[PDB]
């Protein structure tokens, strides 16, 4: 239930018009700056991590 | 009476200590499993979503 | 007319950079006040020197690569976002990085500036291929507040906010009777430019300074249900009033006119149900 | 009742007797939390030979799964009302409508995991307006009977047990009426004959050293069970015919005659001022005697 | 007590078995008592009844 | 939880670590805590797990301290037993 | 280095007597629902307020009783009392006296006039009397809190659910505030919507002042219990408990200290008077004239 749709929504594909072509530093600045602004309901960048 | 320090005492009892959870009809052996209790205000009993 | 303000403290350092202190015993909802308030100070209005340009020898667009050197301008740059300096008073130091051989080029060969501190020497920015590769780039550290992207208007992304990560987790707190207290366990991932218990205390002041300008006895007897006989005999003892009852004592009563001992005990066991007695002294009957 | 209904709400009111309804068109001469008195004839003067009608509201009872049934007043002094128009609502009724629960601000969404399969997540505030609170009324019952040890007795007086204890009984050992019982606490003090034994030679011992010497009798009385408590609003008590009766069963029952005779001091009055103020207007019709019946007694 | 032999002994009886008058037996009966009752060490022992 | 897999990997066929843990328990409980490593939380059960998963207790290793143990009970006695056993006849 | 800009009450619009726009001038960005979210958070549930807490009201025992000339039922009426909004200078704990006989509704403004208290809305009905011989008198406690304190978190007089807290609602909007320097800033504006207990700005300068002290900084078996019982545990007459109190005898521990010659020798102790405490005494294994040799220890 819930759970399933919580992870659904953070990971899925979309135009991403508002939060794409960021580099992510790695995870940890990636989650900085998803929390922060301009990423909503996921993004289409690519992530550091290792 | 229910004179304070009691409940710490209870705290102090149930330490590590299991209790068993079963719920009707018991159609296969995860109807009964067992947890550690976590003491609670009110009158319910708190069950994991994902079991 | 009070609250429950600071009581017992833990600290689990996760590693040399890494902490988990928590505030226990902050009644209840004061852990989403205080985890908002606080992760919104570090995710933003920290201090700290970021790398905000780089000027790369040989190199023009981030697009190119380099001759002799393992990892594209893109990762060089992405590595120089994770280059922690702490600068004594300035908001802008050129750092020069000249560098010829084989292997790792690490922020220890960068030119040693007397303000400049490198945090961690052994962060790898290059690797050169070739031992006729070489790199001369000078990097330019600034000082601000939050994530400032490089789009913001080569550039690279900065990330002034000391701090990388900041997560909460609200808990029920033990604490005595209240019981439905909470403590704020507020996970920090810092960089090692500053201590995790100083961030707070600065996140803290910053919040603080921000808030620096705005810092029985009259009630009738029919109301005790005595019988009509008990009622009736205190009237005519001109005993109208809970009060004028309450004065009274036993030896008294028993010696007015029309009550007995069975009237007397029934008025004790009355009185005794509601907090109240024969021979109560209130000394001051009546204002 | 509900924000969105089906229109059937009032009907089911209606025919379910717990809301009170006029007999005929009337005026309303009497609101009370304990009853109401209305005055017919308003429109098309149906009563005749005698005018008005009592209706005595249920107040605080107690249903058969021990929810509170009582009427409420919807109406006011001097009103006017026609034929089965509302005038008390029941349990559960709002204005003659059907009311089984509240209206709530809803919204529909996930939250942390709390409303997980079919669970609720409620405001703080209902609580602090009193939505969803529910008033129980229980019934709690003691015999005393005749033993072949001897009689039980529903006594005050209770083998080693101190005052505290027997603070809110009466001389009867029967809880007073607004009292607040707590589990443990005791509602109806009674005392069995034991059926006897030696205790064992420690607490031979013990009791020789506290020296309480024993008692014929055990501790028996009711008290409130665990998870229970509240405010005593009702006793009744029941003595075998021609028992020794003491207090217990002379004061609850002079209380009822005292309550009898003022229904009838009350049903007299309704009548009364319901009876001469019609052949008041009788007699004026023909001998007009304004300024000269209003001064002799009414008899 | 009869906490030996399962019997109350008399008074006289104890008395004539520690070859003391009726009387002694009464005060050291009476003196252990009231080293029994007092308050010090009467914790314990005390509060059993309800 | 307490990396239970790793303790019944120290010892096979899951049920025989019970018995195994129960047993060390009830030691624990009726004479002196004393044993190995020592986290000094959480109860005889976990305490006994715990020991177990550093191969403390050992099935064989327990039956070897109650060998020992049956010996250490024949000291005392011995001689004294001996003096018990020796006067009848 | 750029110091920050700091905010400082700067308008107010009282809509109504109980609904204001409160407005914090000059801040940086993202802290507008920062200490919004802060500040509502103190408001909604951390404000000081008076509430009726019991109720007395003459001839009424239970408050299921319903009365001879009242409209509405006992509890209807603790249920009124409930919304009595009352604004008391500087005590913790007011009473009220309300008499009324007539026909009509009982406000809150028929409430006898006290000096301190200041009753925010005296057309609030708290009854209907309805025969002209109808009359009630009450005596409504009133006292200084916070929170919602419920009737159940615990004598011939009912209990009601303690409302604390002066405020109903908060909102908040940040806004772009205005000054062509910095260009930068946004203005917090808090709508409220109170009782009328509170004033906008010391609401908000409370709130504030809630928050800053939850941020002060970041740091890194012997003897007879029986003994200090209350000599009222003994259960005596109320007058020897009332002598022995005026010795200065207050706990068991006094009193078995206290020898038959000394306290015989007290004005208000006769001899049926020893006679019942030896008796009492002796019925729990105590007695007169014991010593227990360190009175007391901390």
């Given at each position: 239930q819930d759970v399933v749709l919580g992870l659904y929504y953070m990971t899925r594909d979309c135009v991403n018009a508002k939060g794409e072509?960021?580099?992510?530093?790695?995870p940890k600045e990636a989650e900085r700056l998803y929390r922060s602004g301009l990423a909503s309901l996921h993004a289409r960048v690519k992530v550091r991590i290792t | 009476r229910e004179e304070a320090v009691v409940w710490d005492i209870l705290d102090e009892v149930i330490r590590e200590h299991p209790v068993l959870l079963n719920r009707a009809?018991?159609?296969?052996?995860?109807g009964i499993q067992a947890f550690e209790p976590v003491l609670i205000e009110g009158k319910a009993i708190q069950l994991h979503p994902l079991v | 007319t009070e609250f429950l303000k600071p009581r017992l403290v833990d600290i689990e350092q996760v590693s040399s950079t890494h902490a988990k202190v928590t505030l226990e015993p902050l009644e209840r909802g004061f852990g989403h006040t205080l985890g908002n308030a606080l992760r919104r100070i570090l995710l933003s209005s920290m201090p700290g020197c970021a790398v905000t340009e780089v000027e790369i020898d040989g190199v023009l667009h981030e697009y190119s690569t380099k001759e002799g050197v393992q990892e594209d301008i893109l990762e060089i740059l992405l590595n120089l976002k994770g280059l922690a300096v702490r600068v004594q008073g300035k908001d802008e130091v050129i750092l020069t990085l000249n560098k010829s051989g084989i292997g790792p080029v690490t922020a220890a060969d960068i030119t040693h500036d007397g303000d400049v501190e490198i945090?961690?020497?052994?962060?790898?920015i290059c690797h050169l291929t070739d031992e006729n590769a070489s790199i001369s780039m000078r990097i330019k550290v600034q000082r601000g507040r939050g994530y400032v992207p490089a789009s913001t208007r080569l550039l690279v992304d900065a990330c002034y906010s000391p701090v990388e990560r900041i997560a909460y987790n609200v808990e029920a707190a033990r604490v005595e009777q209240r019981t439905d207290l909470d403590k704020l366990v507020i996970e920090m991932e810092t960089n090692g430019t500053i201590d995790p218990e100083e961030a707070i205390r600065r996140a803290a002041t910053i919040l603080a300074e921000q808030l620096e300008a705005f810092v029985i006895l009259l009630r009738p007897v029919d109301d005790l249900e005595l019988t009509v006989r008990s009622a009736n005999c205190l009237k005519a003892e001109a005993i109208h009033y809970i009060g004028d009852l309450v004065q009274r004592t036993e030896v008294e009563l028993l010696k007015t006119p029309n009550l007995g001992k069975k009237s007397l005990t029934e008025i004790k066991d009355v009185l005794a149900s509601r907090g109240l007695s024969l021979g109560m002294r209130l000394e001051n009957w009546p204002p | 009742k509900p924000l969105v209904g089906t229109g059937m709400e009032r009907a089911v009111a209606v025919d379910s007797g717990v809301t009170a309804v006029a007999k005929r068109g009337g005026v309303v001469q009497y609101v009370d939390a304990s009853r109401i008195v209305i005055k017919v004839?308003?429109?098309?003067?149906?009563?005749?030979?005698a005018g008005i009608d009592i209706y005595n509201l249920t107040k605080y009872t107690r249903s058969n799964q021990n929810t509170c049934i009582n009427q409420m007043p919807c109406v006011s002094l001097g009103e006017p009302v026609e034929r089965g128009d509302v005038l008390a609502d029941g349990p559960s009724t709002d204005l003659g409508e059907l009311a089984l629960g509240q209206n709530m601000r809803v919204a529909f969404m996930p939250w942390n995991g709390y409303n997980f399969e079919d669970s609720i997540l409620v405001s703080e505030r209902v609580v602090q307006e009193d939505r969803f609170t529910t008033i129980h009324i229980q019934e709690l019952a003691c015999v005393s009977r005749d033993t072949k040890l001897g009689p039980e007795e529903i006594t005050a007086d209770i083998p080693n047990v101190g005052e505290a204890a027997l603070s809110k009984l009466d001389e009867s050992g029967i809880v007073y009426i607004g009292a607040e019982v707590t589990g443990g606490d005791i509602l109806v003090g009674k005392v069995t004959p034991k059926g006897e034994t030696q205790l064992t030679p420690e607490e031979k011992l013990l009791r020789a050293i506290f020296g309480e010497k024993a008692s014929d009798v055990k501790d028996s009385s009711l008290r409130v069970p665990n998870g229970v408590s509240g405010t005593v609003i009702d006793v009744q008590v029941f003595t075998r015919d021609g028992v020794e009766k003491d207090k217990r069963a002379l004061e609850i029952e002079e209380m009822q005659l005292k309550q009898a005779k003022k229904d009838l001091s009350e049903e007299l009055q309704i009548l009364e001022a319901g009876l001469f103020s019609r052949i008041r207007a009788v007699l004026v019709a023909g001998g007009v005697e304004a300024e000269k019946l209003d001064k002799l007694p009414r008899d | 007590f009869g906490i030996d032999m399962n019997t109350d002994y008399t008074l006289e009886e104890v008395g004539k078995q520690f070859d003391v008058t009726r009387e002694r037996i009464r005060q050291i009966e009476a003196k252990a008592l009231r080293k029994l009752r007092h308050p010090s060490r009467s914790e314990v022992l005390r509060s059993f009844l309800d | 939880r307490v990396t239970v897999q790793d303790a019944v990997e120290k010892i096979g066929n899951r049920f025989d670590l019970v018995l195994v843990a129960a047993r060390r328990a009830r030691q624990m409980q009726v004479g002196?805590?004393?044993?190995?490593?020592?986290?000094?939380?959480?109860?005889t059960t976990v305490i006994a797990l715990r020991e177990i998963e550093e191969g403390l207790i050992n099935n064989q290793i327990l039956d070897v301290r109650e060998r020992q143990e049956q010996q250490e009970q024949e000291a005392a006695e011995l001689q004294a037993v001996t003096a018990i056993a020796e006067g009848r006849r």
């Open positions: 072509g960021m580099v992510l530093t790695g | 009809p018991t159609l296969h052996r995860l | 945090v961690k020497p052994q962060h790898v | 004839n308003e429109d098309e003067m149906y009563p005749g030979e | - | 002196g805590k004393d044993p190995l490593v020592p986290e000094e939380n959480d109860k």
